[PDB]
Design a protein around this nucleic acid. Sequence first.
DNA 1: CTGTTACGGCTCCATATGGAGCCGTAACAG
DNA 2: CTGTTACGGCTCCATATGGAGCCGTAACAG
Lengths: 795, 795
Amino acid sequence: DYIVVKGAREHNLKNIDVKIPRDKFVVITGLSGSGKSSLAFDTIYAEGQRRYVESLSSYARQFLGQMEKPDVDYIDGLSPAIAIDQKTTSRNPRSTVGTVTEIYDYLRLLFARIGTPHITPRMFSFNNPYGACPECTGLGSLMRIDPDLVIPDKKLSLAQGAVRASGWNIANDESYARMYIDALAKHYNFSVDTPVEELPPHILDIILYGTNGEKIKIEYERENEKGTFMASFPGIINSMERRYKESEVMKQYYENFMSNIPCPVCKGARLKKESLAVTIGGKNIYEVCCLSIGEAKEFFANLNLTERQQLIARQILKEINARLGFLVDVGLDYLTLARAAGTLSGGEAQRIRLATQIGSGLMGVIYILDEPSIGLHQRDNDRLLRSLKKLRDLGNTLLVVEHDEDTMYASDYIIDLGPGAGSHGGQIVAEGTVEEIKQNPNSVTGEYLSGRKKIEVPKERRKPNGKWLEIIGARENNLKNINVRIPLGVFTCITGVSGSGKSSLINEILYKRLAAELNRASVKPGEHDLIKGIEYLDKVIDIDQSPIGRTPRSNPATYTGVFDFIREIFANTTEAKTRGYKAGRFSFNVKGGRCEACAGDGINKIEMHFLPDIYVPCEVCKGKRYNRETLEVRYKGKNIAEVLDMTVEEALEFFKNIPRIHKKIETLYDVGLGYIKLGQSSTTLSGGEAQRVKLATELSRKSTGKTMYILDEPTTGLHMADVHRLVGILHRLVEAGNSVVVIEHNLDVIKTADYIIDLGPEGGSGGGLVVAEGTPEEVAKVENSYTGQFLKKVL
Amino acid sequence: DYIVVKGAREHNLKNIDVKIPRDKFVVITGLSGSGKSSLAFDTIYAEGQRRYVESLSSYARQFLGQMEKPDVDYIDGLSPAIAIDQKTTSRNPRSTVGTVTEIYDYLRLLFARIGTPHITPRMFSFNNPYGACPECTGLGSLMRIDPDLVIPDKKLSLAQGAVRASGWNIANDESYARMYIDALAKHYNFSVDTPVEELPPHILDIILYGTNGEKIKIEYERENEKGTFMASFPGIINSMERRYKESEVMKQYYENFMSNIPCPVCKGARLKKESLAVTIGGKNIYEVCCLSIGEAKEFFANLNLTERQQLIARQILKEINARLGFLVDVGLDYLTLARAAGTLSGGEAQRIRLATQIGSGLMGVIYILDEPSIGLHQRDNDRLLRSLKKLRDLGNTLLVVEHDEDTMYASDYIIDLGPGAGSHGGQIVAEGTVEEIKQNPNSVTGEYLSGRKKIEVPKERRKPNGKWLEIIGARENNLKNINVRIPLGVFTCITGVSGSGKSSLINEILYKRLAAELNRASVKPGEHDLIKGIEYLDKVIDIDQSPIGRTPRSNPATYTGVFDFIREIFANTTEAKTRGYKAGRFSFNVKGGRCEACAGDGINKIEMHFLPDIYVPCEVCKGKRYNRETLEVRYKGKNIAEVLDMTVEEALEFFKNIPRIHKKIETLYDVGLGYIKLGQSSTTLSGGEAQRVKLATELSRKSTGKTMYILDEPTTGLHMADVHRLVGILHRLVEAGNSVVVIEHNLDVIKTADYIIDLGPEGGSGGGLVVAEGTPEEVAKVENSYTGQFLKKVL
DNA sequence: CTGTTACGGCTCCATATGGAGCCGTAACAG
DNA sequence: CTGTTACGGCTCCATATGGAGCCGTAACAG
Ligand SMILES: [Zn+2]
Ligand SMILES: [Zn+2]
Ligand SMILES: [Zn+2]
Ligand SMILES: [Zn+2]
């Protein structure tokens, strides 16, 4: 009844031995990068998934690929595990909230059994051709590529760049598209250089919609080849639609070309017109699915029926009521049962998955969670804890990677990693009951819980300088035409209930408009009337969890900007001058200094007969990514490889005599990155490391006092000490002369902010108007505000 | 703690309600096709797999596809489930028994830790390039296509059909291959019609191995297109190898072209020569892995080492000993740890998977088994039962679909379906303890267990007619050069221990030689000297579980041969003669009578935008697969659709007045097919239905007394009544004048056979010689024979 | 010296025809 | 009448080039 793990050597784990009780609420806490996330995800979930897959069918195993076996000696008492995290799934327009939560089938059964006609369960489904809309094929949206978007200027000629779509540009004469267009124009007696405005409608229709089955002969010309062939032109729009039907970035780029409109026939009901005639209680399936969760639950609880109907559909009603109660208890009460699954956030998706899992009721399954208390306001923390306890009580086990102090008191076993991070961390410090870790002086978390060290409340708060940004006519999504006023040069925090519209109001309006008006970004903004005060800003920077580099040719050393100084000081040594070298030779991205065999990568491709290609360290240069000639030059007893393999603390200690490098190294050390190596590849960097690198790069560059920063949930997967460092770095950034706007639900970040904007008072269509604004004390004095009440309670 | 299933409507289930206890040994028994297999596999395992998949990652779910949701109201208390059956997995040559059983990693760890050099775990692995053989790339077998096989006769010219490979024939002048060959010949100054024997060696080398990077210009000619292009010829062998590297039938066909030989460098060790130098106890890794399981266990138990080594590798030794004990206890003790996983039978693969699962030790997982007692001799039934009990005891649940009487006594809960099969069956009859079902007179299984009805022992046994088949120099696989003598015209049964070589000796020798010498089959036989008595046989027929038709255009009605008579009698009616029709019009595979809209299929393709195409019954002809014009003709108040939708019993009752149809219908009814419909598609037919159809077709055709039948495990998934009917049908076939040879481990089939041949006395290389032969009483009198001892005990 | 801007070079990711088995039909022999 | 054999017709399965983001370098201004 114990999960005993002996000999774990993944990432930075120093051969730890841990025993975790089963069928109990167990949480794991540690610093950012200390190794808790690796020890959980890469070891336990990976081992469980691989063990379950190896026993499945051969074709299923091949489809799922070969999962990497973790470097662990032996693990016993392991059950199949499923991991729930914040990973949005755009998927397909077919999937909605109703089908994901597994309630649409029950609604179909109820409508078929009881719903009187104005009658089969298969008829009501939009996933089958039996009862789908003939026009939209069940999608409910007539999505087509906008003819005006592909050719924004019809007056401009085709050769001038009329087409603005990838894979269809006619600028290059060597492309097959240009030859096809020329052949079509020759067949239709037209010239390519003729402006589209002067082009006949028939020619434009043929170009944009194919030849309607007509076949023509087009000759092809190559470098040394020639000939003739006969085929049919499919059309630009037809080819684009086929490619879209046949990845995420490419799908998003293609969807940007097209526009989504409601289907004119069924008005986006995804069902046949005859099927909508069936009604129960005066409402059909579409009206029921278009209401919120709370209203739907109230309607179902207040439904009137005879004894025979209740006896016929007792179990259906019980199951629907239980599922709706679980959905309203997990923390969601504003969602609509018809909203597409694509338009959701990470927290909402994770909560929906948790609700589906608890409603389904699986037994003997290990559950892995990744910070479930993020993206949600503090008013639903009790509901989330109750739902998690209910999930645990049925006979499962929970491994919640949570950092909130409230979650610790509700846990039965706490495993704390540390003491530091990276090389310093990776060992188990203390474990046991919450009281034991509270009384344990060897852990930072226990000291924080006991109140030994906490975040103090600032005494002096800055005031706006008089330059205030104004928003007029904000109506994006579920905004009820409200006007807000954000000050400048002051740390600004925006709070509100989950799904109140603050995230949309920020991301889809403010950042997009600022980018379009300042950085010249071709992004369509949201619905707004006008923005006042745009002249007071010069640069806009957005910080997210996306990796800083998609290629292994980048590293934090070159991203921060210290690599140029390192190369200059290496080339300025006596040996380099004697050899007549250059500052560009000490790099692993140009020819001359990097290893020629491995092309400055350190890994060579070793292809196997029946195995995917496996990369091994290069043996020509021992994986140092530098030839032996360059390593002959040494500065202060160290070579370039030693510097690149040297940690940040050692770099700070060694480079104290060079102020122009020490300035950036101090920023890198203070931002929180005290364990990474300068030579670490950017691909393996996690979200926290990327955010820290971006913050350090932003802080390093001098500030002119006219910059604004837009963030989103900056405390995602950060320990309390990490929050205490981040608030200090944000205060330093504000004091530098810039303005920072963040969206954080953490009370610690809010209690220290110099300006609070509240959106509510309820989620969904119920809210959308400003409740209170101003100083934190003023918001606390407000009675009708959850955020104000919590601010008053904490202070 | 209960698995409650309410409202199951899959296949032929009549809305059954079943409750199954958890964490207990539960078996399900029913007649062939009664619905037990459907109720288990299509409902419980499918629901568990879909439930687990829906909670996994989106990409994993897409890779695994969308599993069909079973037609069940609601199921509660379901754990993730894994299904183990007899499905061969050829996979790749990389996978062997050692890596499947998960013992090669432990062997590598032991060798790295203790094995003294003549030292890293990654070095000993053949799945990584670090310590793989440079020549064979870790395969251990240099498999190449035989140059002589593609051109068996070099004297014959290329135009005469020199190439015998699909996709490379030059008979068609319009093929691109012929044009490429002609261009190469023109470049090399040679003629295609020239014989290969007269072809220069350089030309043949270029043709069979490409141009070694040379580029030439080849001109293409089309129906109305022409031109020139430049490319490089890759070569016939290179293209074949690339296609083989890039399915099962195609892979087998390609492997037939090639031959497997040991690697000359490492002698098929799959490891580098330096790696083989490390030895422990005087043996290296290859010698240890080349020994049998029992010898390896004895060697490991008798290994001598100091206290320090034992302390260092205590857990490794314990795990290896436990895994070897489990492997020797499940029922396998003759396998070699280096044999490829491809060369295994279904029962051996299932037992290996069960051993791996019990060794791994998963908790809270539903286990589904498909007749685990088949393919195994009765002497290991106790070992299999003990292994299953050990698997159940650790905290899992078992759902074993077993028919053996011995397995019933070891079960704790029995769910019996019936009472008949097909439409008659599909309902739960009785359930409970063994005593309750034994005392229940409403179940056939209880009556059989109580001894109310049993299989009697025949009193008179036939004798050979003097024409005896002789086998000389049998040396295939693990045969120790023994000679056997099989009589003719007498029911012959071959028994032996599991993996004694009887299956190989039959399939790879007797059937292949008979097919080659009689039916002109181009199949390479096994290693044999000569076969005597081949002149006494005329036809050879093999019966297996393979489906009889891969297309929905076939059905048992047309496979048996009664459809021609049905069409003739339909066309002979007065209305057909008046209309001037023909006997070919009443068919669903020719033009004129079948529905033109659906092309006589009854289903139309409805393509969706973002969903795989879903087939829906045709509405033009209501899915009757016949136009309204043909249905106007009625015979005896019934139309052709009614006849095709009429069951076998009703057809027998109705068609009693036509002897030429009644003769085949009586055979179909007596073979055991009393529930299927004549119009049922052949694709949905299972193994038992296909075997019954084949047996009925064979029995229907008149016998000249010069035919031999070869079978294999005919009692796979057959109830006791099914066995009692099959033995009667086999005795009828023998009395008809033919000879039947079967390989059955069931004691009931053996005790009634008129001739018994025993192979043993042990599995693997230990056995291979005939132990006893002759009458069953003579075999029983033999003391040193497990089969003889069991025959004496039962009699 | 220090910051900004423009350009060159680089890598990673994205987008129809032949063979085998079966059914129906005609001819031939008993 | 009944079995065998040959052939025609049918269906299912199988086999390289352009764009986006980043690093390095030169020129210009303060
Ligand atoms: Zn529609
Ligand atoms: Zn190298
Ligand atoms: Zn080799
Ligand atoms: Zn039809």
